C-alpha cells in the first residue's frame, strides 16, 4: 500500500530541464523492497532528443525521522510510448537498485532531467506536469509494484 | 486508413494454444509502411509463463490478387498489463520487420502462441477472443500506425 505526493520545482513553460520531485510514503503494514518500486512521470517530449536523468538528492524518512541517503540508488530511463496521446508520448520511469521502504517510512526524490543537446521544452502539454510549492496529492503521475499499477492514472 | 479483420482459429474453451488469424486491409489511397504497424491480442494469461509465438504464414495480397510471402517478417511479443480488467492482464503484439502495404492490398497472418511449459489456456475469459469460420469485423483487437491507436476499443 502506498501514498504518491508530488510537484514540478521548475515551473517554467518553456525550459530545458524538468524537475520533478516524489515523495513515496509506505502506509501499509509491511516494509517494501525499493527494487520492485518504479514511478512514472508522463509527458510530450517536444522534438525527439537523447535525454538524461539525473537525481540530486534521494532519501529514506524514517516515522521517527531517521535519514538514510539514497541518491546514488535512484536510476532513470526515457520510455516512448507505444500509444500516445495529445499530452503524453513519453515517460520517465524511476526505478531502485535496491532498499526498504517500511511502514511508515517515505523516499523523497528530487529529480531533474534534459534533453542530451539542452533543447527546451514545453510543460504546458505535459500530463503529469504539476507546479506547486510543496508535495501535493497527484493522481497524473503513476507508481507500481512488480509492474502493477498501484497509484495514479494512466493516460 | 485501416481496416481490421478477425477470427480465432481454435475455438476449444481449455487449450494449450491460441490462434490469432488476422486479415488487415489498407483501405487508403497511400502505402503503409508494416514496420510502423502493431496489432494487440488482449487476453488473461491464465497462470503467469514465458510465452512464444510463431507466424505458421503471413502474406501481403494485391487488390489484384498478387501474392507475396511474408512469413519471417512477422514477430510477437508479449506485454504483461500494469492495470488489468476481469478478461485482459496480458497481449500479444504483433510487428512488422518490413513490407509496404499498397493501397487496396491486405495482409493475411495466421499467428499461435504457447507458453513454454506449454501448459493450458482458458479462452472464455479474454478479451479479444472471436471464434468464427472466417475474418469478421472485431473491434476487440487493436492496431497502431506510428504509436496512434487507429482501430479496435482498447480494454
Ligand atoms: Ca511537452
Ligand atoms: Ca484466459
Not at 517536444?46 to 539514497?70: E, L, M, P, R, V
Request: glycine letters at 8%; proline letters at 3%; a negative charge.
Amino acid at each position: 500500500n502506498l501514498k504518491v505526493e508530488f510537484y514540478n520545482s521548475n515551473p517554467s513553460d518553456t525550459t530545458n530541464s524538468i524537475n520533478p520531485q516524489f515523495k513515496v510514503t509506505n502506509t501499509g503494514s509491511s516494509a517494501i523492497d525499493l527494487s520492485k518500486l518504479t514511478l512514472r512521470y508522463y509527458y510530450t517530449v517536444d522534438g525527439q532528443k537523447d535525454q538524461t536523468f539525473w537525481c540530486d538528492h534521494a532519501a529514506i524518512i524514517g516515522s521517527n525521522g531517521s535519514y538514510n541517503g539514497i541518491t546514488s540508488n535512484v536510476k532513470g530511463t526515457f520510455v516512448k510510448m507505444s500509444s500516445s496521446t495529445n499530452n503524453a508520448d513519453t515517460y520517465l520511469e524511476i526505478s531502485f537498485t535496491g532498499g526498504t521502504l517500511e511502514p511508515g517510512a517515505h523516499v523523497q526524490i528530487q529529480g531533474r532531467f534534459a534533453k542530451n543537446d539542452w533543447s527546451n521544452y514545453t510543460q504546458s502539454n505535459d500530463y503529469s506536469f504539476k507546479s506547486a510549492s510543496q508535495f501535493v496529492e497527484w493522481d497524473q503521475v503513476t507508481a507500481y509494484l512488480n509492474g502493477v499499477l498501484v497509484w495514479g492514472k494512466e493516460p
